[PDB]
Amino acid sequence: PQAVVVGVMAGEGVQIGVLLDANAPVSVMTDPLL
Amino acid sequence: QAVVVGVMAGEGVQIGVLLDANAPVSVMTDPLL
């Protein structure tokens, strides 16, 4: 339960499967995720 | 040479740490923990 796997959609349509931290606040992840 | 990075830990708590530039990750992940 410490992490969750989700599909992130990016420019023009590429879908990428990623394992994100389930409890950190969302504003902390958008930059390195990009 | 050195570097400083934001190391995330339990429940997402943000922590800042200073690490060496040339030593490999394996020799530092233990003392860092």
UniProtKB/Swiss-Prot annotation, chain A:
Subcellular location: Cell inner membrane
Gene inactivation effect: Mutants are defective in the secretion of EsxN, PPE41 and PE_PGRS proteins. Mutant is highly sensitive to detergents and hydrophilic antibiotics such as ampicillin, vancomycin and bacitracin. Virulence is attenuated both in macrophages and in the severe combined immune-deficient mouse infection model.
Function: Part of the ESX-5 specialized secretion system, which is responsible for the secretion of EsxN and a number of PE_PGRS and PPE proteins, including PPE41.
Stated family: Belongs to the EccD/Snm4 family.
Domain of life: Bacteria
Shown residues within the full chain: 18 to 51 of 503
Protein name listed in UniProt: ESX-5 secretion system protein EccD5
Note: Was identified as a high-confidence drug target.
Species: Mycobacterium tuberculosis (strain ATCC 25618 / H37Rv)
Record note on quaternary structure: Part of the ESX-5 / type VII secretion system (T7SS), which is composed of cytosolic and membrane components. The ESX-5 membrane complex is composed of EccB5, EccC5, EccD5 and EccE5.
